[PDB]
Amino acid sequence: GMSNKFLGTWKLVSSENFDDYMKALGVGLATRKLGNLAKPTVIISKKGDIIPIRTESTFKNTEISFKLGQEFEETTADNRKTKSIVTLQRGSLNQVQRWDGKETTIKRKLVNGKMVAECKMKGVVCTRIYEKV
Ligand SMILES: CCCCCC/C=C\CCCCCCCCCC(=O)O
C-alpha cells in the first residue's frame, strides 16, 4: 500500500508552471493571481484503508478521502465537481480527475524526503515541491 513516508504535514516550497496549469483547467485571472501567491499546507493521513488528504491555504481549503482504486466524488480548489481515482504505481500516488469529458492527473511521489507533485492537463505540466514540517 501507500508508504507511511507520505504521512504527515507538507508545506509548498516551490511551484513551477502553475499559472499555465490553472489556465489549462479554465481558471480565471483573479483566481490564478491568488492561486500563484498561495503556499498551501498538505496533510496526508490514514484511517484504516481510507486516505484523507487535506489542503490548507488562506485562499482555499480542500479535503478528499478515498480508498485506493475506488472512484469517488471530489470538489476541487477551483470548484470543479470531478469523479476521481487514486492509484499506486511504483510508489507514486497518482490521482486522476475526470469531468465534462476532460481529465487531469496529479502524481505525488517522494524524492529525497520531499514530496513532488506533478500536475498535467492538456500537455501542460506543473511541478510543485513540498517539504515535511
Ligand atoms: C491546491 C491549491 C489551493 C489554493 C490555490 C489554488 C487556487 C485555485 C484553484 C486552482 C488550482 C486547482 C488545482 C490545484 C492542484 C494542486 C496540486 C497540489 O499541489 O497538491
Numbering used by the authors: 0 to 132
Provide the authors' own sentences about this structure as they appear in the paper.
P2 is a small 15-kDa protein with a β barrel structure covered by an α-helical lid. P2 belongs to the family of FABPs, and in all crystal structures of human P2, there is a fatty acid inside the β barrel. An important feature of P2 is to bind lipid membranes and to stack them into multilayered systems. Recently, three point mutations in the pmp2 gene, coding for the myelin P2 protein, were linked to autosomal dominant CMT1.
The largest difference is triggered by the T51P mutation, which decreases the area of the β sheet β1–4. The mutation hinders the carbonyl group of Ile50 from forming a hydrogen bond with the amino group of Phe65 in the β4 strand; Pro51 also cannot form a hydrogen bond to Ser44 in the strand β2. Two water molecules in close proximity to the residue 51 and the β2 and β3 strands are not found in the crystal structure of T51P, but they exist in all other structures. Only ~5% of T51P was soluble, despite optimised cell lysis conditions. P2wt, I43N, and I52T remained 100% monomeric for 24 h after SEC, while T51P was 98.3% monomeric, and high-molecular-weight forms were already present. Tm analysis and CD spectra illustrate a drastic reduction of the stability of all patient mutants compared to P2wt (Tm = +65 °C); T51P has the lowest Tm, +41 °C, and already at +38 °C, the conformation of T51P changed and unfolding started. In MD simulations, palmitate-bound T51P is overall much more dynamic than the other P2 variants and shows strong fluctuations in the lid region as well as in the β sheets β2-5 and the loops connecting them. In simulations of P2, especially in the case of apo T51P, opening of the β barrel at the gap is observed. In addition, multicomponent analysis of the SAXS data indicates a 7% fraction of open conformation of T51P in solution, while the other P2 forms exist in the closed conformation. However, T51P showed a reduced capability to stack lipid membranes; the turbidity of the vesicle-T51P mixture was approximately half of that of the other samples.
